[PDB]
Design a protein around this ligand. Sequence first.
Ligand code: CA
Ligand code: CL
Ligand code: CL
Length: 245
Amino acid sequence: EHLKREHSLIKPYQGVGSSSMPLWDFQGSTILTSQYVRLTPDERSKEGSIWNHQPCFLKDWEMHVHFKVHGTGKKNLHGDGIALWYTRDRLVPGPVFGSKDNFHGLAIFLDTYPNDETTERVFPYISVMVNNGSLSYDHSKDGRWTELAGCTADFRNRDHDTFLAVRYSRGRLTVMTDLEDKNEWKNCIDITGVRLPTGYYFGASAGTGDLSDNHDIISMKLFQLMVEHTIDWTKIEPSVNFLKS
Ligand SMILES: [Ca+2]
Ligand SMILES: [Cl-]
Ligand SMILES: [Cl-]
């Protein structure tokens, strides 16, 4: 395989129920079992996260995330969601799906509650954000101002496993979903001109506010992609270049 075990979270989770070294830190409301990592319980005002121990120096990679978001809150009465991160900093809790705002790097947000009273989107909504420290995620508008790309995705309270794939290679960022039990990656997001350095950390976080939900990570499997390259990659500033209209 091109699986990088050191950047993966897999049952039985290394170093947790044993003497070996763990590969992730568990932070905040996060709790372990043998079958999942629960970032938040179905309780209000929680923030939990997991952060990979080692910085990733792969230039080209694909993360497969087996997650589960589930709860008993009626109607639209659930929240807030999960974020996946490839960021300069790790372990800092905060208001952005459990983690710090004004981050450096990449976020993939799985947003389950529409804060935006005048929203056009259908939720739950998966979106991507690239940040160089300057941008703040605006909850009241569901991060509308800072979203690069996004898609509606029915990932909540499902009777079968739910997965997301996040692929990053040569400026191209692709997010795909497997939510329907078709054993198929369905496209959600596909953009180019994304500039991210090496040496950042993988992480996942979730938060709840006045509304709650269980947010579980079952596994995260990171694969190295076999990509020819013909420059200090740790010094790349996170940014996006845009095609002119
Ligand atoms: Ca929201
Ligand atoms: Cl692990
Ligand atoms: Cl279902």
